[PDB]
Symmetry: C3
Subunit: 117 residues, 3 copies
């Protein structure tokens, strides 16, 4: 899966190693192998969340098969909020998540697409 | 709604307070409460827009219900171009926007999804 | 088309002029005019790809009409991997691509949307 995290926390307020710990967390939450998890963290941005510029973070999660339903996204959301609130020292009011289903023809890897792998 | 703004203007050429003013602007344009508007600004990037590396900006707008039609996106585009050209001191040839409808099951907030709120 | 490239290579390890060369490359690969290609490069990020924090890059490609099939995305992927592996000095295991079809009502330009242009 593909995880992208935008935050207005400066880089030195994002704990060292977060991107690796987010791979492990996403593996357990989403039921995907940790070695297929991709994480991108973009710190030091200028952000407002819910109209406020206090420290905050935005997570996007894209995956085949597992982020397409309300019922399971509710579960994923609970677990990712637990992880991110503690890791980033942010309240639950300062994080939002978006979920994006992907199809195999959308994922380019090793010079082809997943449809053929 | 969720607004993301990429620009190759350095941070010191993006006027102070832009992310808050974009919340107010988006609230009026989209008919959503300002306290539900999220803005992410990513300055200092390396960008080409329409093949040219002159100063430029890319805006993405995601929301439930209001960014799904050509007719209303035409209106939203006009208003956001007015706002951004003046705020960023950019010509209309140096800005592009993309609109992305969202569904409630895609938005994670407070450890659940909007389907259940 | 719209190309976005995230990388954990620092800016000084992304070759000068890459965003312009990516416009030319995308024009030939996708069959679109180079003066309609948009490229955004976001370097110096914190990234894991396939669970590993070694140097890597993520490319997203969005366009009308041409990135919606497995068969042609397979071709696009091959060509973009050739370009990016050499430009960024990265192995094919360190790059992933995502393809996103767009419709004309989603693209805001010159204060309207492409539906009306």
């Amino acid at each position: 899966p593909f995880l992208e995290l935008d935050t207005n926390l400066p880089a030195n307020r994002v704990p060292a190693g977060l991107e690796k710990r987010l791979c492990a967390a996403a593996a357990s939450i989403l039921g995907k192998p940790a070695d297929r998890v991709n994480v991108t963290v973009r710190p030091g941005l200028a952000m407002a969340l819910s109209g406020s510029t206090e420290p905050c973070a935005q997570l996007s999660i894209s995956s085949i098969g597992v982020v397409g339903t309300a019922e399971d996204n509710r579960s994923h959301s609970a677990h990712f909020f637990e992880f991110l609130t503690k890791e980033l020292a942010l309240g639950q009011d300062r994080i939002l998540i978006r979920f994006f289903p992907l199809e195999s023809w959308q994922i380019g890897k090793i010079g082809t697409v997943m449809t053929f792998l």
